[PDB]
Amino acid sequence: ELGAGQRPLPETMIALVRLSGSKGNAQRGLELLAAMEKLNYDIRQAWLILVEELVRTNHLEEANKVFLKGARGGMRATDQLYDLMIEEDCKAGDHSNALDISYEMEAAGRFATTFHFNCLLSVQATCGIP
């Protein structure tokens, strides 16, 4: 499609990153997302799907890399994604990433309710320091 010389459709671009997320290829997924920004598209909506796919395929560590990098950019994730991403990290004992994600959510305009703090406490209660 690039060799022919026309701009790929966003649906094609969205399908590409979703396929990469299904196989957990983080490097391929981020490279395609960079192309969309270079193609001047809405990277945020595709960025949500890639993060969800990595969580769906249990590639949580790679999902943290993708989610945080988008989080530092300034784009705001959906409410479900914040709840999903934080809960998975706390279930996996990833409070370091969960707390960092929670801080990004606070800067994104959403405040941590009781649910988000409960996830964090599930890990802090096992650190041995009350």
Partner: protein
């Protein structure tokens, strides 16, 4: 709103003789001396 947590514990307590030796690791002192009067050593 998540407070920027900063936990800094500052404990004090009696020190075991082993940890006293750990401070001097060998730092045994036996001569009750100081700078020499003439050589200033």
């Amino acid at each position: 709103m998540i407070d920027r947590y900063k936990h800094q514990q500052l404990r004090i307590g009696l020190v075991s003789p082993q940890q006293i030796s750990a401070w001097a690791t060998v730092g045994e002192v036996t001569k009750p001396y100081t700078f020499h009067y003439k050589t200033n050593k």
